[PDB]
Amino acid sequence: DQRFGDLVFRQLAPNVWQHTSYLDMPGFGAVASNGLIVRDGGRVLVVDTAWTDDQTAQILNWIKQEINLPVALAVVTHAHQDKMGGMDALHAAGIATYANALSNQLAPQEGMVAAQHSLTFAANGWVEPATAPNFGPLKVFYPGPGHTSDNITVGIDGTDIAFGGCLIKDSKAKSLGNLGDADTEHYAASARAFGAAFPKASMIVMSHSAPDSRAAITHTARMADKLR
Ligand SMILES: C[C@@H](O)[C@@H](C(=O)O)[C@H]1CC(SCCNC=N)=C(C(=O)O)N1
Ligand SMILES: [Zn+2]
Ligand SMILES: [Zn+2]
């Protein structure tokens, strides 16, 4: 683990890093939020911002120092603060940002800054390639409504890594966390759909825990079963 400012960076694979930022919430303590950094050829790709614009700027600063390649694009997995909180930092730096069309539509109501481009998805959940230009190893999948109506997920092609965001919780988790915006009826099916979308992924990266095995997906699904 590497510390850079208030952020921590961990290499998960030769070309993949996890970024972690913290937000102190009064009465509840500091909460960690994870994202991904992917090196693809002569460019870098980001998945999710940090909690804030300042923290996100630090991600770009670490990238400059540790990777020294231009950041080509970023993808945010839904319209909540821990995933979209630092959109300004990305846009200030001239980085093209992509999100679920629904996330961009919800963003203003959520107090978030919308991404600059919209992803749309097929009936089977896979992104329509036309809306996801030059994503390299990033394979984006909409598993259906769960944590939120708009949550999307990301696999890293050519690695054992898949990113479930706030949809997937780790196998040690006691609850499904914040269900304030959740679709409790479809949550279980969506978690399982993600598992089926990336059947070979063995390392599951998520928003609020260290990377886990596929057990995180199944354990989440089974916790969600009880919500019905
Ligand atoms: C604060 C907001 O961004 C919230 C969300 O996205 O729903 C953050 C905080 C949280 S709570 C973190 C884990 N909580 C466990 N009780 C989650 C989450 O559950 O995914 N995401
Ligand atoms: Zn959320
Ligand atoms: Zn979260």
Numbering used by the authors: 43 to 270
Q: What did the paper state?
A:
NDM-1 belongs to the B1 subclass of MBLs that requires a dinuclear metal center for full catalytic activity. Zn1 is ligated to three histidine residues, H120, H122, and H189, while Zn2 is coordinated with D124, C208, and H250. To address whether carbapenems undergo pyrroline tautomerization during hydrolysis and whether diverse protonation mechanisms exist for different β-lactams, we conduct a combined investigation on NDM-1-catalyzed hydrolysis of imipenem and meropenem using X-ray crystallography and NMR spectrometry. Our data presented here revealed informative details of the reaction including (i) double-bond tautomerization in the pyrroline ring following the cleavage of the lactam amide bond; (ii) three derivatives presumably representing EI1, EI2, and EP; (iii) absence of the bridging water molecule attributed to steric hindrance from the newly formed carboxylate that is forced to take a distinctive orientation resulting from the trans configuration of the β-lactam ring in carbapenems; and (iv) exclusive stereoselective protonation of the carbanionic intermediates.
Six imipenem-bound and five meropenem-bound structures were determined by molecular replacement and refined at resolutions from 1.80 to 2.32 Å. We first modeled hydrolyzed imipenem or meropenem in the Δ2 isoform in all crystals and found that the ligands could be well fitted in density in some structures with good planarity remaining among C1, C2, C3 and the sulfur atom bonded to the R2 side chain during refinement. We finally modeled Δ2 (EI1) in one imipenem- and three meropenem-bound structures and Δ1 (EI2 or EP) in five imipenem- and two meropenem-bound structures. In four imipenem- and all five meropenem-bound structures determined in this study, the carbapenem intermediates present in either Δ2 (EI1) or Δ1 (EI2) bind the dinuclear metal center in a consensus manner with hydrolyzed penicillins or cephalosporins revealed in NDM-1 strucutures. The newly formed C6-carboxylate contacts Zn1, while the lactam nitrogen (N4) and C3-carboxylate interact with Zn2. The sulfur-bonded pyrrolidine ring in meropenem was also well defined in density, but the hydrophilic formimidamide group in imipenem was rather mobile, as indicated by higher B-factors or even the absence of visible density. The crystallographic entrapment of both Δ2 and Δ1 isomers sufficiently demonstrates that hydrolysis proceeds via an open-ring derivative with a negative charge delocalized over a conjugated π-system covering C2 and N4, which is dynamically stabilized at the active site of NDM-1. A tentative equilibrium between the two intermediates, EI1 and EI2, is thus established before protonation occurs. Owing to the lack of the bridging water that may serve as an ideal proton donor, protonation at the lactam nitrogen (N4) seems to be impossible.
